[PDB]
Amino acid sequence: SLLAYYRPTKTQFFTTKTEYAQILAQKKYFAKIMALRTCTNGVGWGAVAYATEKPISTQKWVIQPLNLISVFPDDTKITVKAPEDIAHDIVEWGQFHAGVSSGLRISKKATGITGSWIAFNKPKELDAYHGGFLLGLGLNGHLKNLEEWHIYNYLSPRNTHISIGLLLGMSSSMKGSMDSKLIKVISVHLVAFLPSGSSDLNIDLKLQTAGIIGMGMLYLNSRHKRMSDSIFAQLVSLLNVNDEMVADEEYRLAAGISLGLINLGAGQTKQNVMYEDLTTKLLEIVTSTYDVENDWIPENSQIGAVIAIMFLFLKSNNFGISNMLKVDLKEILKANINTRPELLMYREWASNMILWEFIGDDLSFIMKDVDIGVKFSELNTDLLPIYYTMAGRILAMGIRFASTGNLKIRNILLSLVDKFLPLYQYPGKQNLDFRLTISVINVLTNVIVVSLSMVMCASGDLEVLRRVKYLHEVASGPYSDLSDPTAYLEDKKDIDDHYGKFISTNLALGFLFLGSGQYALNTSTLESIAFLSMSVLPTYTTPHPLQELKHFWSMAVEPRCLVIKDISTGDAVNNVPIELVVEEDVEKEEVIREISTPCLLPDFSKIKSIRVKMHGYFPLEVNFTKDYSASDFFSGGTIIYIQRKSESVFENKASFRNVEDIHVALKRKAAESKNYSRGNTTSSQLVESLGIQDLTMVELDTLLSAALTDSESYNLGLLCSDKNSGDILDCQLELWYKSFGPH
Amino acid sequence: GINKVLDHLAPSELIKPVKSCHNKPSVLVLDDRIVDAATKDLYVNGFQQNPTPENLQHMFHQGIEILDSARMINVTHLALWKPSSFKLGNPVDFALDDNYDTFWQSDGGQPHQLDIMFSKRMDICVMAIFFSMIADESYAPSLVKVYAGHSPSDARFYKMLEVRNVNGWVALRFLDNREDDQLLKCQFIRLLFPVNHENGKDTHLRGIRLYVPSAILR
């Protein structure tokens, strides 16, 4: 109900005033704020419904348009209209996000989704919804080979959203095949990669950023030189829009992630010459200090270079590369410091991930080498780097323990969010030094809630949900309680701040309940962390660069839901205790973990044995040796079946080997009476009435009926003197009756 | 110790007194007809018919040397500049050439923007702008808003400037953001000129400068 979007949204307003006109203004402001929430619920809804609905092929898909209509407890509905109430671009950006979620809702294994099906589902009028739907299908891995017939039909209009959706989705479906017929499409789209001297063709900058990321992700694990060098030049070089030179931070960030992904896992070298040359070239970019700002190497390329040196040595444990990336707080706080401070959080997050063994789970790792060291404890710009220090370390902390679950990390994040929550969005003394610092606080508290949601993924935690609910609701900010274009820009900054504050809480909401809680993220395969890391990129500040990439954690999501089914009946049986053998995420020996039946077990590679025990079905315990892992065992399916035990009269011939505890016997009788409430009606009673329960006694009575030949006489004697059997005394006592009884 | 420093980085109950901000943007008065100690601090050339341009060119100089007379460091040429658009007649060099006769003119959309983005973290303390109400009434900047931030991403509103009558250098030192430091600490500064006097279209910029703190042989 909190996350639903295809309905009027419940609102609560402070309105700490009595004037009617003032109250209406705040309600309109809250309506505009809630309109932002509706636009940005696309990220949340995508994770809530991952592979829920299945396609019928013949059936036609439907996409619910954005409602963005707010409802107050007073039931005086206020309806937001574009572009009078909110920025015009926001409304169809939310439509595009909703379209991606709808497109992603289709399962990966679904068949029948060919190039004709999308054309069949075309709304005959291109819009943001279809562009998102086009992105979702390609993102899921359905656009493996899209026909060239309607590629031009989609791309003929210069609309950005549809072109963005096609380029990202189509590249994602193929994902590293290095096909020429598709790579040339982006090559035409990208203006700088187009041959030099050609007359400029009008291509939107966001489209190029869409083209460059799709193309780099087209070249995944290619390690491909004639493209990688061109990408490196693209990051350094300068662009052209509207016939005038321009430098974009968004494109350079898109270029940096593009280069890093193409050469992912290419840094574990002890090709090295060109890799070392590219490594030192990137380090020159990130470490160069310029007293005078050069035009063609601005600070905008710093983030792309860091995210490039991110992915090259991912999981490489190269201490030296981390050191020249890691920044020491003690030395920098003494100095004036240089470059954008936002580079620091990327740099430290870069160093921490290189050492993919030393990500500390304790607060000491977070708080390592941090001290205010100044009398002026008031919030001042001098102490921003430690905040960006904090954000980078915790983000690496959260991604490291992704979906694995824990308690110490959760408690530490709970303490951190509790401390930083009250300061959030507090424009008390309107001072820019204070205002810039608290903007970083907003960025920091967005990182903490995301990371806290990351580590506790798919758990449906209470307090984590409790906090993210808080950051979800109440706009707060300058309005409520706690020259025309200028006021437009002044309102534009605040409305954009609320949009960035909402995307983080929405993303946290979706990850708490991923795939209805039965799907979990992957951090085993090398590229999964790459997609996890890229999608978790904090771009919450204006202009929210590269936002459409938020719907890309989908490659890292999978089963790891385990359930039990019966064999003879073939139906599912649940609510049986399951004991698990784990490594406690550390080198410790083991801890027994008891869980219910429909529960998300930890990663298969860390599990050594699993056993099922419950009153009734006989136990089944399997231990995983080095030869076979749990992943290989569950490769055919994540479901293991169990055989039913039998309460047969024939089992208890004369004596009961069963203990027959009084409590379970009373429970069984009560259970049977419940069905009886909702007698010789059972065939077992019939065979009991026949008096032929004892199989052996009956047979020997028939055999002894008459003789007593020596061979058979010794046979019965052998059965009488059996080392182990059941009704031995009954057998002994029959033969005595036969031998010396009345006749 | 770990907890106490986190409290210093994150003062939860210590900071927020009442949470009762007015949230309105403060407006700075630039008029030169009233004499006050605070105005004299920000207005340098002194309060005064319209002077002829040669007096304007004259007074343009003493305002320069008076600002340069005090112990101060000029880093106007230590950053990259990118206006909204040129007019192919005069780049921002004629605005930063410290010459009244030459000036820079933009030509494009009504909300003209002037970008001052720095390479390194430099702490600016005094902001110097020269205006000419009578020499450039057609293109006089009537409405000025200065931003602040550490990057083009995080540019934020800093101060309000309404222009009624200023023929002279305007000194803009920053005290609101940091009362302890009495200076501004940002790497990204941008200026907007959304409207001119008497409903003008374009805007000049006669002078601009940036101030930061810190016999011979031939």
UniProtKB/Swiss-Prot annotation, chain A:
Source taxon at top rank = Eukaryota
Cellular location(s):
Nucleus; Cytoplasm; Cytoplasm, Cytoskeleton, Spindle pole
> Can you tell me which family this protein belongs to?
Belongs to the APC1 family.
What does this protein do, in the record's words? Component of the anaphase promoting complex/cyclosome (APC/C), a cell cycle-regulated E3 ubiquitin-protein ligase complex that controls progression through mitosis and the G1 phase of the cell cycle. The APC/C is thought to confer substrate specificity and, in the presence of ubiquitin-conjugating E2 enzymes, it catalyzes the formation of protein-ubiquitin conjugates that are subsequently degraded by the 26S proteasome.
More about this protein: Present with 178 molecules/cell in log phase SD medium.
| Subunit structure, as described in the record | The APC/C is composed of at least 13 subunits that stay tightly associated throughout the cell cycle: APC1, APC2, APC4, APC5, APC9, APC11, CDC16, CDC23, CDC26, CDC27, DOC1, MND2 and SWM1. APC1 interacts directly with MND2.
Its recorded name reads Anaphase-promoting complex subunit 1
The organism named in the record is Saccharomyces cerevisiae (strain ATCC 204508 / S288c)
Tell me the name of the encoding gene: APC1
| Parent-protein start and end of this portion | 917 to 1746 of 1748
From Swiss-Prot, chain B:
Signal sequence interval, chain numbering: none
Domain spans labelled DOC? 51-214
Q: Which superkingdom is the protein from?
A: Eukaryota
What SMART domains does the record tag this protein with?
APC10
The keyword Transport is annotated on this UniProt entry: no
**Could you list the residue ranges forming a coiled coil in this record?**
none
Primary localisation category:
cytoplasm
A Pfam family annotated for this chain is ANAPC10
**Any single biological process term in GO:** protein ubiquitination
Q: What does this protein do?
A: Component of the anaphase promoting complex/cyclosome (APC/C), a cell cycle-regulated E3 ubiquitin-protein ligase complex that controls progression through mitosis and the G1 phase of the cell cycle. The APC/C is thought to confer substrate specificity and, in the presence of ubiquitin-conjugating E2 enzymes, it catalyzes the formation of protein-ubiquitin conjugates that are subsequently degraded by the 26S proteasome.
What is its quaternary makeup? Answer: The APC/C is composed of at least 13 subunits that stay tightly associated throughout the cell cycle: APC1, APC2, APC4, APC5, APC9, APC11, CDC16, CDC23, CDC26, CDC27, DOC1, MND2 and SWM1.
In the record, the note on similarity to other proteins reads:
Belongs to the APC10 family.
Q: What is the protein name given in its UniProt record?
A: Anaphase-promoting complex subunit DOC1
What species does this protein belong to?
A: Saccharomyces cerevisiae (strain ATCC 204508 / S288c)
The top of its lineage is: Eukaryota, Fungi, Dikarya, Ascomycota, Saccharomycotina
> What's the name of its gene?
DOC1
